[PDB]
Design a protein around this nucleic acid. Structure first.
Lengths: 102, 97, 90, 78, 93, 107, 97, 78
DNA sequence: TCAGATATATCCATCCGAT
DNA sequence: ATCGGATGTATATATCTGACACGTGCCTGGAGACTAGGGAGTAATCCCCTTGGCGGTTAAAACGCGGGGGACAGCGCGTACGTGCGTTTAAGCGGTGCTAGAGCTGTCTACGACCAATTGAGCGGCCTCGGCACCGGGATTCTCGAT
DNA sequence: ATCGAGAATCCCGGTGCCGAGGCCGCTCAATTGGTCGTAGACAGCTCTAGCACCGCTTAAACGCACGTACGCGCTGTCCCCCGCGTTTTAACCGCCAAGGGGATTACTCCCTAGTCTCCAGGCACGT
């Protein structure tokens, strides 16, 4: 399999057929789907490790969307990429303005 | 007996309502309102339940965002209470109007 | 048709002792689809911009540089270049 | 008339999650109006999308398409 | 080489609407860019809609749906009416 | 026989063959029909006529013969529908519509 | 001996500037500022004048809108003079962070 | 220190065109900062686009695309 | 197929109301 | 500051349970080989478009100085708005049944891709005078210290 | 609650100027007329989940007192932004030379689409 030839986990074939069938361009290259597989692997790996860290910070061994919300909103770079999106059943990080407190 | 000074209970319920993830809005009145609004554009429609759930999630999130914005607007004028002028200001600035 | 087992295997690589819900699975699937859509659309638009006719590595590298914020871009392009050179090496 | 289905305590709960101490009595009607206008703004696109496909039921993908059209992406329903 | 522009057509439309009004070149550039922007936006919405339904061709009705989605309110009402009037002219041939 | 242009068959003014060639070249779908480009050309013609009417009216209002970007900016900003369609676009060399806050006015 | 009231020239210049459509910003300082900024990414770059003018138009329109927002936010606060709290609030509410 | 080339009168003229009446002294530094940030965010993308096409001159259309990235859609040029 | 929501006793950090 | 009682907070213990991760089957998508030809990489040339400088000119930027009016701090009041308490209402929840319509299957024909003539509409080069900016003068209307 | 000197602004008319519009010559992209493979238009069958109804239960919505704190108006202080005069200087205009690179044109070559042939791992399914 081509995926193991580059030592990744995401499939080259699926992204290849998506790229050809999605009708973005007339012709496709050869190493480009591999590049996509790499970048997607990087993004998923980092977000999963962040979510797992946030989950084990709550003495939990399972990921829930609350953990995902807390992880996404706690990074300055990740918050910039996904600023304009709402996560289902995610809640909001706690914040209270200082003037309100007596 | 022990009569709580006002504001402390109001200061409370931020801790529980910022850690909760519930919908906070009844299901049946919301579904009836959605059907009432949809009645105008086209009669005799049927609604998927998942669509209703997603609609509810999007609506409540939008209201939470608007309330955060209007609170930040209202704290500016050396005041603590929300006034509809603040809502008008918030919808005026961010480009909704 | 989803990316179900692949994210699970990646998690096993990074965290061998944690589980996820089905809702987290859906969030991952939708997020990956959205990011893929953004990258592919930007690559296509840029490929038309230069009167070009194919999608190559340069186009997607440029798109990744364009979309992601500053610090993540360096790591992403480095890992992608590592992957492509390992692939073309064999 | 169904716009009165949103009682005061629901609005207060949403506001408390928003992080507020005190609310005036005039807020409720403004919140109701904003909510309503948001509803027709979404449902117009939703019904158009479901009408083009020659069906009679609004699937969840239609709502997701309607929300993404306005730039408010929703994750969780495919 | 040669550059393509919408200048002649828009000039003809102006002379059809207001008989005795002039045009500056900057306004012509504004009109060309505006037409290109509208065309691209409509075409993109139509192409996405055709993908959403597992289709493989471009008919008129999804263009109509895109017009109903993009143009705000009553301005669409004329436009759709302007479309159906035109197309049935061509079908008569 | 004598060739007739398709835009003349429909009575339109915007070219039809150009739209068809662009849609084929624009790589939007595998194939296109014949009824789409005429509809698209009609929509474009209607929109540009609608804008040109208000532009000419605005220019006439200030006793001027040509069209300048200031006139187009005023025409777009005056109509609420066109403003909504063009709510996040910057017109170069267009200026700003006149507006003075009421409280700021001296008593 | 004839001096205007302190707040009457302002309206006259509001009128004359709002009926104006010129550039309002010097060309050479802006050009050298753009070159100074661009020297940090890839040295020995050759800009085009049309690009410089485009940057002028975009930046000036953005600033005009931002001060409109700031003026509105200030006049909400029962004040006339603007202070940096207003500009920071407007930037934050618009979402630019 | 070229950023101080944006003089006080120019800021005054832009503020007047905005429609404000009285300005405090400390606004100038804030404006000079925010404008600098905006130019950074535009020029970065513009330089990327120009670099991709193996060119060393920045044409105006590339700037038009770069503004199109943030959804500004400059009219006129190109 | 057991990790986790939930009933039960309890539980520690905080606040009014004078003092 | 200071304490006492009294509310609501975490923590452990136990007890279901329902998504959960783990095997299983098989076929539709994933590799592997050979070909062509068309798009893409490379060499060479120009011409124009940018860069850089020089010197005269004055519009605009910079500096300084009253002085009035807007920002701000403090005082006081009364009313809209929190909070508990009794009471009613309709939202959940769990069953049950009926059926319009989503969704999948099998044809064939009208419809658009494609190719070879065929030609007239659209672009570039070259006039040219008429609307329009500028300026100068007079006539007009708002303004502020005076009434 | 008015007025006049004065300062800013509208209006008429004369002047030069340059590009908006018009005219003509020359192409290649639009037009006709054919063929040919197939996408979906159409008809038909199925089974599900969407709608409707009912009985029960209880958490929550609501009306009501009641004490209060803070929103708002008022008064008063004081300092700092504006208006105006006075004094530089660098933007700006017009002019000039120079050289480099962004398009062009020609040429050749190699990389992916296409076609066919073979083979398993990943989607439902069961616990």
């Amino acid at each position: 399999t081509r995926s193991s030839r580059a030592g990744l986990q995401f499939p080259v074939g699926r992204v290849h057929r998506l790229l050809r069938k999605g009708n973005y361009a007339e012709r496709v290259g050869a190493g480009a789907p591999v590049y996509l597989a790499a970048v997607l692997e990087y993004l998923t790996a980092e977000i999963l490790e962040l979510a797992g860290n946030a989950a084990r910070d709550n003495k939990k061994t399972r990921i829930i969307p609350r953990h995902l919300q807390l992880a996404i909103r706690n990074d300055e770079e990740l918050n910039k990429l996904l600023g304009k999106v709402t996560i289902a059943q995610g809640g909001v990080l706690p914040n209270i303005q200082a003037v309100l407190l007596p | 007996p022990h009569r709580y000074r006002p504001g402390t209970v109001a200061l409370r319920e931020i801790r529980r309502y910022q850690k909760s993830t519930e919908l906070l809005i009844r299901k049946l009145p919301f579904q009836r309102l959605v059907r009432e609004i949809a009645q105008d554009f086209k009669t005799d429609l049927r609604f998927q339940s998942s669509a209703v759930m997603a609609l509810q999630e999007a609506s409540e999130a939008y209201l939470v965002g608007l309330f955060e914005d209007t609170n930040l607007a209202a704290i500016h004028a050396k005041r603590v209470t929300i006034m509809p002028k603040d809502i008008q200001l918030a919808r005026r600035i961010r480009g909704e109007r | 048709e989803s990316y179900s087992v692949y994210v699970y295997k990646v998690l096993k690589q990074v965290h061998p002792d944690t589980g996820i819900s089905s809702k987290a699975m859906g969030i991952m699937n939708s997020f990956v689809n959205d990011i893929f859509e953004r990258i592919a659309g930007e690559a296509s638009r840029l490929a038309h911009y230069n009167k070009r006719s194919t999608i190559t590595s340069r186009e997607i590298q440029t798109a990744v540089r364009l979309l992601l914020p500053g610090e993540l871009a360096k790591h992403a392009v480095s890992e992608g270049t590592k992957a492509v050179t390992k692939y073309t090496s064999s | 008339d169904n716009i009165q289905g949103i009682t005061k305590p629901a609005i207060r709960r949403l506001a408390r999650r928003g992080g507020v101490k005190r609310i005036s009595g005039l807020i409720y009607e403004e919140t109701r109006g904003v909510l309503k206008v948001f509803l027709e703004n979404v449902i117009r696109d939703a019904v158009t999308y479901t009408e083009h496909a020659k069906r009679k039921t609004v699937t969840a993908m239609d709502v997701v398409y309607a929300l993404k059209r306005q730039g408010r992406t929703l994750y969780g329903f495919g």
